[PDB]
Write a protein that binds this ligand. Sequence first.
Ligand SMILES: COc1nc2ccc(I)cc2cc1[C@@H](c1ccccc1)[C@@](O)(CCN(C)C)c1cccc2ccccc12
Ligand SMILES: COc1nc2ccc(I)cc2cc1[C@@H](c1ccccc1)[C@@](O)(CCN(C)C)c1cccc2ccccc12
Ligand SMILES: COc1nc2ccc(I)cc2cc1[C@@H](c1ccccc1)[C@@](O)(CCN(C)C)c1cccc2ccccc12
Lengths: 85, 85, 85, 85, 85, 85, 85, 85, 85
Amino acid sequence: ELDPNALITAGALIGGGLIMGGGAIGAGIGDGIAGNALISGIARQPEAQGRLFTPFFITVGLVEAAYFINLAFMALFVFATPGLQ
Amino acid sequence: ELDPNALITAGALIGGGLIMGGGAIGAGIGDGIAGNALISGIARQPEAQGRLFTPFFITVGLVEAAYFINLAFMALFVFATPGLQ
Amino acid sequence: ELDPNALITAGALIGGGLIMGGGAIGAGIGDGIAGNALISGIARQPEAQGRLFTPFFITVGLVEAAYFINLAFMALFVFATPGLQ
Amino acid sequence: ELDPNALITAGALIGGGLIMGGGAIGAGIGDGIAGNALISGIARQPEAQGRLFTPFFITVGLVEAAYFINLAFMALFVFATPGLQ
Amino acid sequence: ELDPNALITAGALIGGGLIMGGGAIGAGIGDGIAGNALISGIARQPEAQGRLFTPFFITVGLVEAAYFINLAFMALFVFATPGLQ
Amino acid sequence: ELDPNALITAGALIGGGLIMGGGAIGAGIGDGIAGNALISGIARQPEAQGRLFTPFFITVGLVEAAYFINLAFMALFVFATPGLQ
Amino acid sequence: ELDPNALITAGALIGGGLIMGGGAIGAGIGDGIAGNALISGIARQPEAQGRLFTPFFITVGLVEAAYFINLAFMALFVFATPGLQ
Amino acid sequence: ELDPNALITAGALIGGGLIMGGGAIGAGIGDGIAGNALISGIARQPEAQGRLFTPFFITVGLVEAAYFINLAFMALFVFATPGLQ
Amino acid sequence: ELDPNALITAGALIGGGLIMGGGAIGAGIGDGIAGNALISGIARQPEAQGRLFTPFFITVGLVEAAYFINLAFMALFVFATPGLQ
Ligand SMILES: COc1nc2ccc(I)cc2cc1[C@@H](c1ccccc1)[C@@](O)(CCN(C)C)c1cccc2ccccc12
Ligand SMILES: COc1nc2ccc(I)cc2cc1[C@@H](c1ccccc1)[C@@](O)(CCN(C)C)c1cccc2ccccc12
Ligand SMILES: COc1nc2ccc(I)cc2cc1[C@@H](c1ccccc1)[C@@](O)(CCN(C)C)c1cccc2ccccc12
């Protein structure tokens, strides 16, 4: 027979899946869009290369912070579930 | 045997996952898109570097406010669940 | 055991989650896209850019109204739940 | 113990959340994409400004009609739930 | 005590929300994208204004047909639910 | 109390909803994107545009076939439910 | 009263709806984006028409293979459900 | 009367549908985007045809690997379900 | 009848599904977008293209790390389920 934590943990795993699924959508498309501009800018001005890598890494850093903060809360959700009985 | 808060807490965790999962989609894609204009603009005109960071950080400011306001409401949902019995 | 409001509040948290999740996806990406144009236009026409912040704030105003109307209805769902028993 | 309206109302709130979540995604990204073209067109031809505002407001009007019609049905779903017992 | 139509009606309302929530994503983003070409085209060549509204309204016609055909099926789902017992 | 078809019909309405929701997202946005090209190409080359309506209708034909095949399977799910008991 | 296949079949129909909903999103937007480049390339070089139709049909073929393979598994899910009891 | 594998199998089928539904979104849109550059590039310079197929198939290789690795895990979920009792 | 792990494993398969679904959406589309730039840049600058594969593989590296970290957590959810009883 069920118990309250079976329901709480099921919610937690779905909740955690939503957090990382959305995190990977944000990060994969975000990084690809940042890389796109990098590849294009180099293609247009192949000596611009040096000055493009700082704006690129700032963008990626922002994108990846969302992925990583999401990851941390997915870890909280399934390894230390808030509201667990 | 199930109790009311088990069900409410499972809903809270799924809602909190929706909130953060949508926040990361918006943040990563929004920031990548902004970053794509920054990188391209710098590639097109290297001395516009400083000029371009101002509208970039205004833009990133707005995208990031959506992410962290969502983060606050996810924390309300899972740490101070409204409707908990 | 369960009671009706456990199920209703669970639906409310999940619906509130969809509402904020969707709101930040529209907001992050809508503002990113608006800011991309702002950044590019400032890169292209540094002088006559003041004429650009005004269409930008209008766009951002529309995008943010969607985010905050959604937020208002999330609050209603989870703090004044319609159909609560 | 549960009752049929607890299940119906839970469905209604999720249903309503889906309607507004999707409404905000459509409206935020739609408006941002319309604003993008507005900001760009002004940047390219800063006297085009006058003739751009009619096509802009037609686009936004279309985008916002979807948001508003969605909002109306979310209101029906949770305040006058069809099929309520 | 639950009855069959409570469950069926809850499914109907979630399905109807999916239908309209996806309709608004498609309508708002589709119409914004069409509107972006209209605005840009008018900005590029002001006297193409009349010429450009024809393919724009054909395009908006198609996007809007998806939105209102979805709206009809959402109404079938929630007002004349198939499978109701 | 519940019977098996209540649960099956509920799954059917939710699955039918996903099918139409997804179909209108692909259709709204696919047609918007096709029409964006049509509008721009007519703006750029008003004379030789007749050659454009033909690739446009092919694209729209493909996009609409996805919408209407989906519609056909939504109808099957909700009017001739596979696995109904 | 329920039976195991009522739950299995409900899962199957939702599962099947997810497969086709996502299939139509992939195919509608994919085909529209392929058609966009076709319409644009013809508009820019109206004699390029001949050499554009092979890359166009390769792209569409790839896009449509995802739709069709998804369709086949949705057919498996709801007409020959794996794990049916 | 329900048994454990009925619930587990229903979860398996929904998870397997998520997996393939997300795979087709990524594959169709990813392949359309790659194909859009191929078509445009060939339109811009007809004799670059052979040159452009190499980076196109590398790109399509990567997009398609996501689709078929997802397909393998969907098959694991529904044909060899982990956790089946 | 049911047992707690039936419900937990079901949540695990659904969460694992969200995680892989999201991962392939980010990966398909992120790599498509990166490859679009690669293809265009090679079409525009055939000589100095070697400088492009290096930003391309960096972008793809970031996009694929998101896909494969997600895959790693899907495996954890479905093969070493956190909170399993
Ligand atoms: C631009 O505004 C519109 N344009 C439309 C265009 C077509 C149609 I058919 C309906 C339209 C409706 C409106 C607004 C409206 C104005 C007055 C009354 C109701 C609705 C609006 O929906 C806009 C929301 N978006 C910005 C996301 C709104 C709703 C709810 C709260 C608001 C609060 C503040 C401002 C706007 C609010
Ligand atoms: C362009 O068509 C294709 N190209 C493919 C390319 C690769 C692969 I591996 C499979 C492909 C399959 C097809 C079709 C097909 C033709 C014949 C038989 C089965 C499938 C199709 O799937 C296209 C659907 N899209 C437009 C969204 C289809 C399915 C179902 C009903 C249809 C009804 C009418 C027309 C097409 C229908
Ligand atoms: C580029 O990497 C980063 N940039 C960041 C930027 C801002 C912030 I605030 C956090 C950041 C965190 C990281 C990584 C990290 C490095 C070390 C330790 C933890 C996290 C990372 O999250 C990147 C994942 N993406 C590629 C999707 C990661 C997580 C998990 C497993 C990884 C395995 C291999 C490589 C990277 C891994």
